[PDB]
């Protein structure tokens, strides 16, 4: 199990993905997701030039040692590029270890804690009515949970969006009222605030939406300063989720220990892989916090498969976001996880159950694509 | 004046440097340091593929807007690659602004607060005696302050005993905390015995201790009155400094591995450190570091910018301008660059009698000679790792 080859693959079967492959002398291989949306080539370079050469000859079985070697050894610690590179290695090594053990990953982690993995779907629309149409559509597909978003009346390179907080705050509660009126109380309803509020504005929104009993209100405020959550938590009983933009337990230790959130959203690809996220989930468990992994299209099927395995074992599972990948993406990344009746089921193949078709990946060259930015009506560069 | 062109230059005149150059429609230009030791190409790619294209056509005068656009706009916030890229842009834009203003950078920032900026030199040796020899020679050169490091008997290799990134793949060092703790105070005792009390004496613990171990070391070295004890413990958990601060009056310095005000807000507000070490090229540039220095000032914390060979003369020049203006200046680290490096980056900052003097040329006073830079191709070099005697991957 000494490493004989390690290299990245960059491919764009509908959107960009970066993948790390590690191959042992014996021939067993593992893959890990290294995709960082809108900054993809920074991770590719971090891996190609600085990490991959150091992997050659290392014992692939030494997962923990390798994690610490890359984390501490980089000298400059934490960060999105850094932790995604480390996550990619970690995911590939856990893939290899599960294969060597002849077990699907969830078994190697401690076995199954649940029989299936609940997901939510994205329901979006220009008007509230448009959104309700999407909710009905996804309910018919078997989803037990939906994230709802609608437009606010009056509202390659980064697209430039315009934002008004005050108009959003007045309008948003009407969406949830309408969802409850049409679909009733049994449906789980989620909403993503996407970083745009100040804490007292989020406190106001949280209170306003209490009657509609949201599964969570997500990313209320930028949280580099973790104390930003305090005012929200002290003013509302609407459950709170945060963390898709985090990469370290150190981004959320205080959020969790002070009981300022209900769900932690940091995913495998950006959170330093299985090794690190086990520790985050375990810390969360002490405070009744549950996992809600970020699961957008910009995390590859490699992350999704590993996440479904993790979701299957972890005691404090909350929910798994599902944004379906394109057929082309699924073809590039064959996998054995299944979606049925609104839930994922983990694969039984040894490893995390995902592979990459390198020949096919090579047919979809990288295409630069950036995330949007958001400005206030006066032009102020805001949070998107 | 809009940005017409922006590009990186990668050169290795003794070691790797990455530089960002921004050129306006009028031809005026600015440069910023983008060097992240041992991970250089990650920053190069971040800039080349993802930042540079978005700079074209922007108003070069909109420094704040650009900083926010890149920081918030990246979506994934903070981190060494991210903030070094942003720092490079920021430094280049301030360079351009100062040139447009016809002023050296320190003037643009608020004018000079001091007539010279005190530095410290690195004194190192295998034995204590070897180190003392180095102190003697640096005192002779006019340094008012020295950092001292020496070998630990029974340990083959220790930090600072010199170009850390000296191998293609990481060198592997071995470490014993207990041997270091019993030996280190002997060094400082020897330095005071030979050189007396007026000299400022610094020491870098380089991340290797736990908090209570650093508390013990701090107490043990109180009699020697160190200027600072640096990087005692890894500080991703900022609370790691608390036990040290509660147990010793030896001054503490931290932060060369930080990149964000959010890495040190609590260290500062709780008064757990005396000097903040985060430098311009890794800490988001002038725009961000002004904010950090100002927060620090409310709590009597002073600046002590990291200044190793792996920050280019572009950073050093900009840092000297910053140091010249900032009220709560502490000290500026000086590790001399190679002749080849100084030639690639012509500059107007000066070193005299143990102090830096800021340049008077408009901008930060540093330029890059691209034809000369092209003579020195990138060569991979990685920082070492450190393992305990039992093989445990530790902190280097
Ligand atoms: Mg979200
Ligand atoms: Mg240091």
XYZ file of C-alpha atoms and ligand atoms in Angstrom:
782
model
C 0.000 0.000 0.000
C 2.889 2.423 -0.597
C 1.795 5.152 -3.012
C 3.258 4.780 -6.508
C 1.286 7.446 -8.347
C -0.783 10.480 -7.412
C -2.242 13.050 -9.782
C -5.161 15.376 -10.406
C -7.814 15.231 -13.094
C -9.595 18.418 -14.148
C -12.843 17.983 -16.088
C -15.988 19.971 -16.959
C -18.956 17.652 -17.643
C -21.492 20.441 -17.099
C -19.315 22.361 -14.645
C -15.745 22.162 -13.301
C -14.535 19.381 -11.021
C -11.055 18.630 -9.754
C -10.295 15.112 -8.538
C -7.224 13.589 -6.906
C -6.326 9.974 -7.696
C -3.881 7.945 -5.586
C -2.611 4.558 -6.772
C -0.698 2.090 -4.597
C 2.095 -0.284 -5.644
C -0.399 -3.150 -5.347
C -2.726 -1.492 -7.845
C -5.527 -0.449 -5.477
C -6.527 3.166 -6.063
C -8.598 5.817 -4.345
C -10.060 9.145 -5.397
C -10.971 12.319 -3.540
C -12.889 15.438 -4.515
C -10.780 18.600 -4.729
C -13.327 20.987 -6.281
C -13.389 24.581 -4.992
C -16.027 26.467 -6.994
C -14.668 29.551 -8.791
C -11.124 28.984 -7.535
C -10.571 25.502 -8.951
C -7.098 25.945 -10.366
C -5.661 27.202 -7.080
C -6.353 23.775 -5.562
C -5.141 21.991 -8.696
C -1.800 23.818 -8.387
C -1.608 23.350 -4.618
C -1.965 19.608 -5.213
C 0.104 19.230 -8.417
C 3.084 21.286 -7.402
C 3.273 20.975 -3.632
C 1.370 17.959 -2.318
C 1.462 15.223 -4.952
C 5.283 14.978 -5.090
C 5.384 14.395 -1.321
C 2.808 11.591 -1.521
C 4.967 9.289 -3.627
C 6.337 6.442 -1.524
C 4.216 7.213 1.543
C 2.297 4.383 3.202
C -1.304 4.939 2.024
C -2.475 3.184 5.195
C -1.212 6.043 7.373
C -4.254 8.246 6.972
C -3.912 10.184 10.220
C -0.185 10.743 9.791
C -0.692 12.008 6.253
C -3.465 14.353 7.376
C -1.254 15.868 10.097
C 1.761 15.926 7.751
C -0.172 18.034 5.225
C -2.086 20.118 7.754
C 0.787 20.976 10.075
C 3.489 20.563 7.451
C 2.088 23.246 5.142
C 3.109 25.664 7.927
C 0.364 28.049 6.771
C -2.680 26.344 8.287
C -6.388 26.238 7.423
C -8.068 27.988 4.488
C -10.249 26.973 1.531
C -7.482 26.049 -0.896
C -5.400 24.349 1.800
C -8.175 22.306 3.356
C -9.713 21.231 0.038
C -6.316 19.876 -1.043
C -6.013 18.004 2.252
C -9.613 16.739 1.967
C -8.923 15.349 -1.489
C -5.965 13.321 -0.191
C -7.903 12.204 2.876
C -10.917 11.075 0.856
C -8.703 9.078 -1.512
C -6.906 7.401 1.373
C -10.151 6.401 3.101
C -11.322 5.044 -0.277
C -8.140 2.937 -0.441
C -8.486 1.750 3.167
C -12.093 0.667 2.707
C -11.093 -1.208 -0.477
C -8.215 -2.884 1.353
C -10.645 -3.874 4.131
C -13.149 -5.208 1.585
C -15.842 -2.967 3.076
C -18.039 -0.126 1.941
C -16.874 3.054 3.709
C -19.810 3.300 6.172
C -18.777 -0.079 7.603
C -15.202 1.037 8.159
C -16.504 4.119 9.974
C -18.458 2.111 12.551
C -21.372 0.645 10.623
C -24.848 1.862 9.775
C -26.871 4.032 12.150
C -29.833 4.404 9.801
C -31.471 2.558 6.903
C -31.575 5.533 4.548
C -30.472 9.158 4.290
C -33.086 11.943 4.113
C -32.465 14.689 1.544
C -33.894 18.064 0.609
C -34.428 19.521 -2.853
C -34.114 23.090 -4.104
C -37.387 24.824 -4.956
C -36.891 28.239 -6.576
C -39.174 30.641 -8.445
C -39.445 34.254 -9.556
C -42.704 34.775 -7.688
C -44.045 32.989 -4.616
C -46.432 31.197 -6.930
C -43.559 30.012 -9.151
C -41.870 28.591 -6.044
C -45.005 26.786 -4.886
C -45.154 25.096 -8.286
C -41.639 23.774 -7.745
C -42.522 22.533 -4.249
C -45.452 20.520 -5.612
C -43.175 19.097 -8.298
C -40.553 17.932 -5.800
C -43.116 16.599 -3.331
C -44.368 14.374 -6.146
C -40.820 13.128 -6.633
C -40.842 11.926 -3.021
C -38.880 14.664 -1.239
C -39.869 15.057 2.430
C -37.972 18.346 2.652
C -37.593 21.365 0.394
C -35.500 24.512 0.461
C -37.643 27.417 -0.739
C -36.491 30.650 -2.373
C -38.312 33.270 -4.419
C -37.580 36.642 -5.974
C -37.950 39.865 -4.036
C -40.353 42.277 -5.731
C -38.525 45.500 -6.566
C -35.241 43.645 -6.961
C -16.840 33.523 -16.893
C -16.408 36.699 -14.828
C -18.495 37.262 -11.678
C -22.067 38.269 -12.487
C -23.161 41.409 -10.643
C -26.379 41.138 -8.631
C -28.156 43.911 -6.714
C -29.565 43.496 -3.233
C -32.005 45.141 -0.840
C -32.146 43.772 2.693
C -35.201 45.729 3.741
C -37.310 44.539 0.816
C -36.237 40.940 1.421
C -37.068 41.073 5.142
C -40.604 42.248 4.402
C -41.204 39.698 1.684
C -39.589 36.480 2.890
C -42.102 35.601 5.632
C -44.873 35.676 3.003
C -43.191 32.835 1.118
C -43.203 30.526 4.139
C -46.806 31.440 5.013
C -47.770 30.484 1.466
C -45.847 27.205 1.586
C -47.615 26.237 4.817
C -51.009 27.268 3.446
C -50.654 25.092 0.334
C -48.646 22.106 1.566
C -49.395 21.883 5.295
C -47.295 21.124 8.368
C -45.687 17.758 7.680
C -43.304 18.982 4.979
C -39.859 20.057 6.189
C -39.200 23.577 4.891
C -35.704 25.093 4.721
C -34.486 28.545 3.720
C -31.050 29.919 2.887
C -30.443 33.579 3.797
C -27.084 33.422 2.004
C -25.060 35.762 4.240
C -26.959 38.945 3.538
C -28.187 40.061 6.964
C -26.762 41.652 10.072
C -27.348 39.738 13.323
C -30.293 41.860 14.550
C -31.880 41.679 11.082
C -31.549 37.870 11.195
C -33.009 37.928 14.728
C -35.999 39.815 13.340
C -36.398 37.366 10.437
C -36.060 34.366 12.744
C -38.850 35.669 14.958
C -41.023 36.526 11.947
C -40.838 32.955 10.648
C -41.377 31.095 13.938
C -45.041 30.395 13.101
C -43.944 28.451 10.012
C -41.576 26.142 11.868
C -38.682 26.022 9.451
C -36.342 23.026 9.508
C -33.594 25.622 9.404
C -32.701 29.195 8.556
C -29.272 28.959 6.923
C -26.243 31.303 6.724
C -27.998 34.289 8.282
C -24.867 36.412 8.605
C -21.163 36.242 7.719
C -19.587 34.275 10.544
C -15.818 34.795 10.441
C -16.632 36.441 13.768
C -18.470 33.543 15.360
C -20.050 35.870 17.937
C -22.193 37.121 15.052
C -24.644 34.311 15.795
C -25.257 35.283 19.428
C -27.954 37.936 18.948
C -29.849 35.674 16.586
C -29.852 32.755 18.993
C -30.926 34.927 21.926
C -33.939 36.277 20.003
C -35.481 33.391 18.071
C -36.329 29.713 18.347
C -36.174 29.164 14.580
C -33.449 26.538 14.117
C -30.164 27.802 12.630
C -27.733 26.233 10.170
C -24.339 27.513 9.113
C -20.981 26.563 7.725
C -20.826 25.686 4.032
C -18.082 28.334 3.715
C -16.045 26.926 6.631
C -12.993 24.678 6.277
C -11.817 24.068 9.855
C -13.195 22.953 13.223
C -11.652 26.249 14.328
C -14.238 28.112 12.236
C -17.062 26.660 14.293
C -15.812 25.378 17.662
C -17.347 28.305 19.543
C -20.570 28.288 17.460
C -21.081 24.690 18.572
C -19.898 24.932 22.189
C -22.026 28.016 22.872
C -25.060 26.315 21.290
C -25.512 29.042 18.710
C -26.450 26.679 15.850
C -28.499 23.530 15.260
C -26.873 22.247 12.096
C -23.296 22.346 10.860
C -23.041 22.528 7.053
C -19.317 22.162 6.353
C -18.932 19.299 3.815
C -16.243 16.686 3.273
C -14.510 18.317 0.280
C -14.002 21.696 1.937
C -13.722 20.557 5.548
C -10.562 18.467 5.342
C -12.220 15.170 4.511
C -13.420 12.267 6.610
C -10.661 12.542 9.189
C -11.533 16.142 10.085
C -15.295 15.966 9.691
C -15.599 12.999 12.055
C -14.113 15.281 14.716
C -16.434 18.157 13.831
C -19.521 15.920 13.913
C -18.455 14.432 17.241
C -17.950 17.874 18.793
C -21.358 18.877 17.435
C -22.960 15.799 19.037
C -22.045 16.971 22.543
C -24.302 19.983 22.028
C -27.185 18.333 20.156
C -25.963 19.853 16.869
C -26.603 17.697 13.786
C -24.916 17.403 10.392
C -26.318 19.068 7.315
C -23.586 18.683 4.699
C -23.484 21.235 1.911
C -24.375 19.221 -1.204
C -24.463 21.498 -4.273
C -23.606 20.473 -7.833
C -20.110 21.936 -7.274
C -19.173 19.087 -5.008
C -18.538 16.071 -7.248
C -20.155 12.620 -7.034
C -16.952 11.563 -5.258
C -17.864 13.865 -2.362
C -21.516 12.871 -2.556
C -20.780 9.161 -2.314
C -18.367 9.608 0.559
C -20.905 11.925 2.249
C -23.682 9.361 1.917
C -21.407 6.778 3.563
C -20.588 9.264 6.343
C -24.311 10.179 6.652
C -25.144 6.503 7.046
C -22.853 5.991 10.050
C -22.840 9.315 11.913
C -25.163 9.250 14.917
C -26.041 12.959 14.791
C -27.135 13.076 11.146
C -29.495 15.906 10.246
C -30.167 15.988 6.498
C -28.314 15.728 3.192
C -28.719 18.421 0.551
C -29.366 17.084 -2.940
C -28.717 19.017 -6.126
C -28.688 16.387 -8.910
C -25.645 16.324 -11.168
C -25.924 16.237 -14.954
C -25.982 12.924 -16.794
C -22.549 13.771 -18.205
C -21.186 14.286 -14.689
C -22.687 10.997 -13.502
C -21.044 9.269 -16.487
C -17.624 10.690 -15.656
C -18.020 9.544 -12.033
C -19.699 6.109 -11.945
C -21.053 5.349 -8.491
C -23.171 2.906 -6.506
C -25.141 5.221 -4.218
C -28.847 5.305 -5.074
C -31.615 7.859 -4.761
C -35.090 6.515 -4.031
C -38.239 8.017 -2.592
C -36.587 11.219 -1.359
C -33.641 9.433 0.277
C -30.128 8.253 -0.499
C -29.023 4.665 0.141
C -25.317 3.990 0.636
C -23.493 1.720 -1.767
C -22.153 -1.702 -0.772
C -19.053 -1.753 -3.025
C -15.786 -1.554 -1.116
C -14.471 2.012 -0.914
C -16.738 5.044 -1.047
C -18.242 3.451 -4.163
C -17.279 6.190 -6.627
C -14.814 5.942 -9.540
C -13.631 8.268 -12.297
C -13.608 7.459 -16.024
C -10.362 9.224 -16.954
C -10.731 8.716 -20.710
C -14.193 10.246 -20.597
C -13.134 13.070 -18.256
C -10.533 14.100 -20.828
C -13.341 14.843 -23.284
C -14.636 17.700 -21.124
C -11.951 20.401 -20.854
C -11.959 23.002 -18.057
C -14.055 26.139 -18.683
C -13.501 29.145 -16.428
C -16.611 30.079 -14.391
C -16.843 32.475 -11.424
C -19.412 32.864 -8.638
C -21.492 36.078 -8.678
C -21.010 39.101 -6.485
C -23.720 41.129 -4.817
C -23.934 44.912 -4.468
C -26.340 47.103 -2.535
C -28.471 49.604 -4.429
C -25.867 52.322 -3.797
C -23.117 50.121 -5.223
C -21.660 48.843 -1.932
C -19.901 45.510 -2.474
C -21.985 43.197 -0.258
C -22.246 39.470 0.553
C -23.503 37.124 -2.137
C -7.573 55.289 -14.618
C -8.545 51.722 -15.453
C -6.454 48.590 -15.158
C -5.132 47.725 -18.613
C -2.985 44.746 -17.668
C -2.207 42.555 -14.670
C 0.145 39.584 -14.419
C 2.380 37.550 -12.138
C 6.140 37.172 -12.292
C 7.759 34.102 -10.750
C 11.513 34.198 -10.128
C 14.094 32.406 -7.976
C 17.114 34.678 -7.334
C 18.304 32.575 -4.395
C 14.782 31.487 -3.466
C 11.265 31.667 -4.919
C 9.307 34.917 -5.169
C 5.930 35.594 -6.746
C 5.043 39.173 -7.656
C 1.870 40.735 -9.048
C 2.189 43.693 -11.394
C -0.752 45.928 -12.259
C -0.542 48.409 -15.136
C -3.038 51.216 -15.783
C -4.219 52.588 -19.130
C -1.819 55.514 -18.701
C 1.129 53.170 -18.203
C 1.586 53.838 -14.488
C 2.163 50.576 -12.626
C 2.311 49.024 -9.174
C 3.585 45.750 -7.755
C 2.712 43.597 -4.767
C 4.344 40.574 -3.093
C 2.474 37.283 -3.587
C 5.044 34.879 -2.100
C 3.788 32.002 0.065
C 6.811 29.899 1.041
C 6.507 26.239 0.072
C 3.092 26.709 -1.584
C 4.074 29.390 -4.111
C 2.334 27.998 -7.158
C -1.040 27.776 -5.441
C -1.005 31.583 -5.120
C 0.304 31.997 -8.671
C -2.649 29.984 -9.994
C -5.150 31.729 -7.726
C -3.989 35.036 -9.199
C -3.414 33.939 -12.814
C -6.630 32.009 -13.348
C -9.125 33.590 -10.988
C -8.154 37.116 -9.939
C -6.225 38.708 -12.794
C -9.037 38.292 -15.333
C -11.431 40.151 -13.026
C -8.992 43.039 -12.518
C -8.935 44.039 -16.180
C -10.990 47.190 -16.705
C -11.454 47.951 -12.991
C -10.811 51.419 -11.589
C -7.337 51.106 -10.056
C -8.163 53.863 -7.590
C -10.900 51.804 -5.947
C -8.653 50.036 -3.449
C -11.296 49.373 -0.797
C -13.864 48.173 -3.325
C -11.340 45.834 -4.921
C -10.333 44.440 -1.542
C -13.972 43.714 -0.621
C -14.742 42.425 -4.128
C -11.957 39.845 -3.853
C -12.437 39.008 -0.175
C -16.226 38.691 -0.146
C -16.475 37.809 -3.834
C -14.280 34.728 -3.496
C -17.141 33.249 -1.427
C -14.619 31.031 0.385
C -13.127 33.533 2.836
C -9.737 33.888 4.546
C -6.807 31.469 4.319
C -3.137 31.714 3.305
C -3.524 31.306 -0.466
C -6.612 33.522 -0.593
C -5.264 36.346 1.528
C -1.820 36.360 -0.075
C -3.465 36.794 -3.475
C -5.572 39.621 -2.089
C -2.528 41.172 -0.368
C -0.634 41.187 -3.672
C -3.428 43.107 -5.377
C -3.800 45.478 -2.430
C -0.078 46.290 -2.239
C 0.068 46.915 -5.996
C -2.935 49.256 -5.796
C -1.481 51.276 -2.907
C 1.762 51.479 -4.893
C -0.219 52.987 -7.774
C -2.188 55.319 -5.503
C 0.971 56.666 -3.871
C 2.592 57.207 -7.283
C -0.523 59.048 -8.470
C -0.360 61.178 -5.321
C 3.329 61.857 -5.918
C 4.120 60.722 -2.372
C 6.073 57.919 -0.705
C 3.606 55.456 0.817
C 4.164 56.498 4.470
C 2.912 59.998 3.613
C -0.266 58.656 2.065
C -0.911 56.641 5.238
C -0.758 59.644 7.560
C 2.866 60.719 7.602
C 5.809 59.647 9.685
C 5.468 58.770 13.364
C 9.184 58.041 13.795
C 12.543 58.990 12.263
C 13.822 55.406 11.925
C 12.524 51.863 12.384
C 14.284 49.501 14.746
C 15.109 46.005 13.531
C 16.373 42.743 14.954
C 18.856 40.297 13.494
C 18.995 36.505 13.638
C 21.834 35.112 15.753
C 22.157 31.357 15.649
C 24.693 28.623 16.410
C 25.093 24.966 17.280
C 26.346 25.658 20.784
C 25.496 28.527 23.104
C 29.065 29.708 22.568
C 28.532 29.714 18.792
C 25.408 31.828 19.249
C 27.166 34.355 21.483
C 29.756 34.813 18.749
C 26.963 35.742 16.347
C 25.429 38.178 18.824
C 28.817 39.839 19.186
C 29.160 40.290 15.443
C 25.647 41.702 15.036
C 26.079 44.144 17.913
C 29.193 45.278 16.057
C 26.989 45.973 13.022
C 24.762 48.267 15.091
C 21.774 46.031 15.808
C 20.013 47.070 19.018
C 18.080 43.805 19.105
C 18.870 40.186 18.333
C 16.926 36.956 18.116
C 18.909 34.088 19.636
C 18.565 30.377 18.871
C 20.991 27.535 19.590
C 21.204 23.764 19.354
C 19.674 21.541 21.989
C 22.146 18.924 23.195
C 20.738 15.472 22.444
C 18.780 16.773 19.464
C 20.234 16.683 15.956
C 18.281 19.612 14.521
C 16.285 22.478 16.008
C 14.488 25.500 14.647
C 16.621 28.417 13.505
C 19.918 26.532 13.674
C 19.783 29.609 7.321
C 17.125 29.118 4.643
C 14.366 26.836 6.070
C 13.022 25.733 2.675
C 16.229 23.941 1.685
C 14.900 20.790 -0.003
C 12.583 19.890 -2.880
C 10.517 17.666 -0.579
C 10.117 18.442 3.135
C 13.162 17.653 5.247
C 12.280 15.670 8.371
C 13.514 16.941 11.717
C 13.310 15.273 15.121
C 12.263 17.053 18.312
C 12.315 16.722 22.099
C 10.332 19.264 24.104
C 11.707 18.259 27.483
C 15.336 18.657 26.387
C 14.583 22.054 24.856
C 12.815 23.312 27.998
C 15.733 22.465 30.272
C 18.297 23.943 27.901
C 16.727 27.145 26.511
C 17.015 29.311 29.659
C 20.773 28.620 29.665
C 21.106 30.428 26.338
C 19.463 33.601 27.616
C 21.466 33.507 30.847
C 24.634 33.333 28.746
C 23.555 36.181 26.460
C 22.866 38.465 29.452
C 26.137 37.469 31.134
C 28.224 38.391 28.099
C 26.294 41.330 26.623
C 24.470 42.931 29.553
C 20.990 44.392 29.935
C 20.658 47.114 27.275
C 20.486 44.716 24.337
C 17.008 43.608 23.263
C 16.859 39.803 23.149
C 14.188 37.848 21.253
C 13.437 34.144 20.985
C 11.189 32.122 18.673
C 9.660 28.989 20.220
C 8.304 28.042 16.784
C 5.050 26.314 17.806
C 6.534 23.390 19.669
C 5.104 23.683 23.205
C 1.767 23.127 24.890
C 0.357 26.096 26.807
C 1.500 24.963 30.264
C 4.965 24.150 28.889
C 5.179 27.669 27.460
C 3.991 29.068 30.781
C 6.877 27.229 32.434
C 9.350 28.521 29.846
C 8.024 32.063 30.163
C 8.476 32.033 33.938
C 11.917 30.473 33.664
C 13.111 33.267 31.371
C 11.638 36.230 33.279
C 15.008 37.063 34.862
C 16.467 37.622 31.380
C 13.786 40.122 30.317
C 13.208 39.025 26.734
C 11.785 41.517 24.238
C 9.465 38.700 23.275
C 8.862 34.975 23.364
C 7.357 34.164 19.962
C 4.900 31.510 18.683
C 4.879 29.473 21.902
C 1.980 27.259 20.867
C -0.167 26.668 17.771
C -2.947 29.215 17.993
C -5.786 28.175 15.690
C -7.544 27.899 19.037
C -6.804 31.410 20.267
C -7.602 30.372 23.847
C -4.301 28.467 23.696
C -2.543 31.649 24.833
C -4.565 32.052 28.045
C -2.552 29.806 30.394
C 0.702 31.333 29.219
C -0.524 34.870 29.834
C -1.917 33.993 33.270
C 1.414 32.474 34.396
C 4.215 34.721 33.059
C 5.141 38.361 32.541
C 7.541 37.542 29.723
C 6.173 39.466 26.702
C 4.502 37.314 24.053
C 4.470 37.582 20.263
C 2.386 35.625 17.791
C 0.938 35.579 14.327
C 3.297 35.080 11.390
C 1.114 32.131 10.293
C -2.097 34.179 10.467
C -3.866 35.758 7.481
C -6.974 37.397 8.944
C -8.011 39.790 11.720
C -10.340 36.898 12.666
C -7.272 34.800 13.530
C -6.282 37.223 16.272
C -9.238 39.415 17.315
C -9.645 37.522 20.583
C -5.893 37.251 21.291
C -5.811 41.041 21.091
C -9.050 41.939 22.892
C -8.289 39.589 25.804
C -4.746 41.029 26.072
C -3.092 37.645 25.569
C -0.217 38.933 23.406
C 2.095 41.956 23.235
C 3.109 41.882 19.578
C 1.183 40.857 16.474
C 3.435 39.367 13.792
C 1.164 38.974 10.776
C 2.897 40.651 7.790
C 1.552 42.524 4.789
C 1.835 39.853 2.117
C 0.122 37.138 4.144
C -2.311 39.374 6.011
C -4.331 40.888 3.161
C -2.048 43.848 2.519
C -2.094 47.453 3.716
C -5.899 47.715 3.735
C -6.300 44.781 6.142
C -3.200 45.315 8.268
C -4.101 48.916 9.050
C -7.260 47.527 10.643
C -5.338 44.888 12.616
C -2.781 47.404 13.860
C -5.544 49.786 14.918
C -7.397 47.070 16.869
C -4.070 46.112 18.466
C -3.470 49.721 19.563
C -6.593 49.741 21.762
C -4.996 47.042 23.902
C -1.368 48.269 23.936
C -0.367 45.583 21.399
C 2.405 46.600 18.990
C 3.390 45.551 15.479
C 6.193 43.071 14.903
C 5.895 42.187 11.217
C 7.301 38.840 10.173
C 10.231 39.683 7.895
C 11.958 36.505 6.652
C 13.807 36.030 3.362
C 10.600 34.512 1.947
C 8.836 37.872 1.906
C 10.260 39.817 -1.042
C 11.781 43.296 -1.023
C 8.382 44.485 -2.273
C 6.840 43.478 1.059
C 9.831 44.813 2.988
C 9.625 48.227 1.342
C 5.880 48.478 1.890
C 6.377 47.229 5.467
C 8.989 49.908 6.151
C 6.537 52.577 4.931
C 3.846 51.062 7.164
C 6.275 50.850 10.117
C 7.190 54.498 9.613
C 3.597 55.722 9.999
C 1.935 53.279 12.401
C 1.670 54.694 15.946
C 1.928 51.334 17.718
C 5.067 50.088 15.991
C 7.093 47.489 17.897
C 9.983 46.176 15.798
C 10.783 45.038 12.263
C 12.426 41.673 11.632
C 15.364 41.822 9.216
C 16.671 38.803 7.339
C 18.958 40.058 4.560
C 18.084 39.003 0.995
C 20.676 37.740 -1.481
C 22.518 40.109 -3.801
C 20.605 38.573 -6.717
C 17.283 39.199 -4.958
C 18.084 42.841 -4.182
C 19.083 43.315 -7.840
C 15.803 41.861 -9.134
C 13.894 44.198 -6.811
C 15.547 47.652 -6.886
C 14.313 49.734 -3.940
C 14.910 52.942 -2.014
C 14.582 51.764 1.577
C 17.819 51.885 3.551
C 19.442 50.131 6.495
C 21.723 52.182 8.742
C 22.962 51.654 12.276
C 20.494 48.855 13.062
C 17.420 50.650 11.675
C 15.455 50.939 8.454
C 14.760 54.290 6.823
C 11.739 54.687 4.540
C 12.166 55.617 0.891
C 11.093 58.990 -0.459
C 10.184 57.900 -4.011
C 6.471 57.922 -4.834
C 4.894 54.496 -4.286
C 6.306 51.956 -1.847
C 9.672 52.571 -3.514
C 10.164 49.049 -4.846
C 10.318 47.968 -8.480
C 10.903 44.694 -10.281
C 13.423 44.251 -13.109
C 11.570 41.767 -15.293
C 14.499 41.055 -17.618
C 16.672 40.192 -14.624
C 13.870 38.190 -12.972
C 13.621 36.052 -16.109
C 17.173 34.818 -15.548
C 16.161 32.822 -12.466
C 13.586 30.052 -13.077
C 11.322 28.736 -10.326
C 12.861 25.882 -8.292
C 10.623 23.926 -5.917
C 11.585 24.136 -2.249
C 9.494 22.967 0.703
C 9.502 23.804 4.408
C 10.590 20.973 6.739
C 8.356 18.900 8.972
C 9.112 18.094 12.590
C 8.544 14.740 14.304
C 8.824 13.719 17.940
C 11.303 11.020 18.943
C 8.577 8.371 18.627
C 7.695 9.440 15.077
C 4.691 11.639 15.924
C 4.154 14.314 13.271
C 4.583 17.490 15.334
C 4.765 21.245 14.726
C 7.770 22.648 12.895
Mg -26.291 27.666 1.365
Mg 8.885 33.094 13.787
